[PDB]
Amino acid sequence: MLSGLNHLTLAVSQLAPSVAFYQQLLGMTLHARWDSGAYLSCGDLWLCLSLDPQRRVTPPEESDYTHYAFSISEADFASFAARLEAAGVAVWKLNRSEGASHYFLDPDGHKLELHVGSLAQRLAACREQPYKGMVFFEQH
Amino acid sequence: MLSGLNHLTLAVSQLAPSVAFYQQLLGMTLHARWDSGAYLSCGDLWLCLSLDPQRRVTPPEESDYTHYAFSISEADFASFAARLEAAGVAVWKLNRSEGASHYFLDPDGHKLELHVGSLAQRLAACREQPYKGMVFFEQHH
């Protein structure tokens, strides 16, 4: 029985700039840092940056849809999305679905997202306007 | 203030095989499924598989170290790692650090991991045997 996500490891090409991105801009808590990576936490999330020479800065058009989204409150959303744009963070997708979403890139091109809402709320929204061929699995 | 990981979206090239891998093999709860993806949950984790034609089946040597690790209890580790090997799931890295770790691949080549241990336990272990040039940022409360 799996109990959830243990940690998220991001391959980075430059450790010093990336540590600033997640600690300074995103306000994550930096717990440890060594010559090959760093340990940060964002609430219940264990984020690990690993220095990888195989890591190339990938433009969004040369990478697939794989992305990682962080939870943020409705009140704090607008100001935080402005913070990243004011800091020059690039956007790789426009929000069109339900709930607040801001799609941005990290220094190495990792596709990140700020999303307001939970899985329970997304399912409820999809019950009123479902996707093409969508089916729901309810256990009651 | 960010409150944690909201959801993890994995681009998949074939929706049906990927949905089976995470629901059947990994035992995750499938909540919804449509022509372009599926919603699954793993404890506090919101997992979303999204069908992306841009997704290419990537062998482990052509992708970087980026990986996603799932929590598992000490008791369940051994049997679960045996379950995956019995089903033919490929391994992309051998465990060398503290705690039980099994590195395996999903149908599309996404590097996954089963890990036993928390960040607090990993930090405590690194205080006795630290990594090269490692420094700790403790506030002492």
Ligand SMILES: O=c1[nH]n2cc(-c3n[nH]c(-c4cnc5c(Br)c(=O)[nH]n5c4)c3[N+](=O)[O-])cnc2c1Br
């Ligand atoms: O010969 C040596 N090789 N070596 C590698 C490391 C190292 N580099 N990155 C990680 C690392 C840490 N934490 C994590 C996590 Br959490 C993760 O997902 N990956 N990851 C890698 C490690 N490690 O824990 O062993 C340290 N010392 C040595 C020596 Br001495």
Ligand SMILES: O=c1[nH]n2cc(-c3n[nH]c(-c4cnc5c(Br)c(=O)[nH]n5c4)c3[N+](=O)[O-])cnc2c1Br
């Ligand atoms: O013209 C159309 N385009 N279109 C796209 C979708 C769609 N496909 N995947 C996702 C989707 C869902 N949830 C998620 C999550 Br959670 C995530 O991270 N990505 N993601 C994508 C969506 N969406 O509604 O956002 C549906 N209907 C339409 C129409 Br009608």
Ligand SMILES: [Mn+2]
């Ligand atoms: Mn998303």
Ligand SMILES: [Mn+2]
């Ligand atoms: Mn790992």
